[PDB]
Each structure stands twice: as C-alpha cells, then as structure tokens.
C-alpha cells in the first residue's frame, strides 16, 4: 500500500514522450520531464508523475516551426538571416522574417518579426525592390 505502488510506463503526449527514453518499469511517486519528437514543443506540464502505479498525462505539443517556404522565400520574403527558408524552428522560439533586401510590405501583410506556434507565424509579403 505505502511500500508496494511502483508504476509502470509513463503515458506520452500528442507525438510526445520522456525527454529520455520511455521506461518500462518506473519508481513510484516519481516525476520526469516530456518533450515531443522533431522540432515540436508541447505546452503545458511535461513533467508527470506517477501515483499509486498509475501516471498521469502530459501536457500538449505543439506543432514546430514549420511555415511555408512556397510562399516566403517565394514572392520576396524570408528570415532575419536571408539564407533561403530559414523558416523552421522549435515552437517557441523567435522567427522575424524580412521583406528580401528591396522590397516593402504590402500593407495587407502580417508581421515580420513574431513567434511560432502550432505551426503558425502571420508571413506578411511584402512588394517592392
């Protein structure tokens, strides 16, 4: 009862898991921290812990840093770094992206300079040059 709970393997999240590798036969009472495979970034508590030979479930990915590239670096756009696409990054992370040295946005356009999230960054367009 107090002695006997170890818990088993520890559930993972959407495409998620163990920062590690997933574990069979686990301590109880005992926590770690998840992540999620690729450049994906869950959100959330991705540290779960085991109660009573029974975990619990992580928090939520989200999709990477994955924008268009037949878009961006398509009619006059790309990164703060102007290295062809450059668009990808982990979910958290900063993406600015620039109007390719010339031209100047649209207006109708989004935002330059953002952050990525669930696979969404507002590309802007931009015209000019």
């Given at each position: 009862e107090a002695e006997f709970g170890k818990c088993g393997p520890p559930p993972p999240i959407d495409n998620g898991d163990i920062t590690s590798f997933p574990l069979s036969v686990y301590a109880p009472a005992s926590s770690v921290e998840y992540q999620c495979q690729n450049l994906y970034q869950l959100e959330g508590n991705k540290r779960i812990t085991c109660r009573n030979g029974q975990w619990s479930e992580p928090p939520k990915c989200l999709h990477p840093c994955v924008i268009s590239r037949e878009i961006m670096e398509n009619y006059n756009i790309a990164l703060?770094?102007?290295?062809?696409?450059?668009?990808?990054?982990?979910?958290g992370e900063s993406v600015e992206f620039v109007c390719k040295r010339g031209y100047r946005l649209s207006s109708r356009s989004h935002t330059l300079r953002t952050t990525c999230w669930?696979?969404?960054?507002?590309y802007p367009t931009c015209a000019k040059r």
């Open positions: 703060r770094w102007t290295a062809k696409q450059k668009l990808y990054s982990r979910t669930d696979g969404k960054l507002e």
